[PDB]
Amino acid sequence: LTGTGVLESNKKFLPFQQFGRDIDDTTDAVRDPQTLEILDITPCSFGGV
Amino acid sequence: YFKIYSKHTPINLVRDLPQGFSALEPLVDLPIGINITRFQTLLALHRS
Ligand SMILES: *[C@@H]1O[C@H](CO)[C@@H](O)[C@H](O)[C@H]1NC(C)=O
Fold first, then answer.
1. What count of Cα atoms within 13 Å lies in the side-chain half-sphere of residue A34?
2. Which ligand 1 atom minimizes the distance to the CA of A33?
3. Residue A46, SS3?
4. Which of B5, B8, B12 is nearest to B30 (CA)?
5. Per-position DSSP letters for B4-16, written without gaps between them
6. Which is the most buried residue in A7, A24, B9, B46, by most CB within 10 A?
7. β-strand partners of B43
């Protein structure tokens, strides 16, 4: 799974659950392998100039 | 793939299924790759 964003979260993931999805269906959180921690994925700052 | 989903619920109803909602969590995913059309329940006898 490839992507760009800033990686702590307070979302209580269930043991089967690995990643998380927002209303838009874009991934918002992921569970990292090796360490099993849950990292919140927030999109990098963008906007109009 | 054989997907088994499970949920354990404490109930106190005597005879039938309680009326309510409980979402089943996924328990295991098995890569068995076989044809299944029939199934059997396994029980335990009580002997005295
Ligand atoms: C390797 O990953 C598994 C699960 O992906 C984890 O249980 C284990 O602790 C990891 N080992 C190391 C040395 O990171």
1. 0
2. 5
3. coil
4. B5
5. EEE-------SSS
6. A7
7. none
What amino acid occupies position A24?
Answer: D
Q: Is A32 in the pocket of ligand 1 (CB under 6 A)?
A: no
CA–CA distance, B13 with A31 (Å, rounded to integer) = 39
Q: Where are the beta strands (DSSP E) in A1-49?
A: 20-21, 27-31, 38-40
Q: Are A25 and A35 in contact (CB under 8 A)?
A: no
Given a contact cutoff of 8 angstroms between Cβ atoms, the answer to whether A29 and A41 are in contact is yes
Instruction: Assess B31–A contact: CB distance below 8 Å, yes or no.
Output: no
CA distance A2 to A27: 11
Resolution of the determined structure in angstroms stands at: 2.6
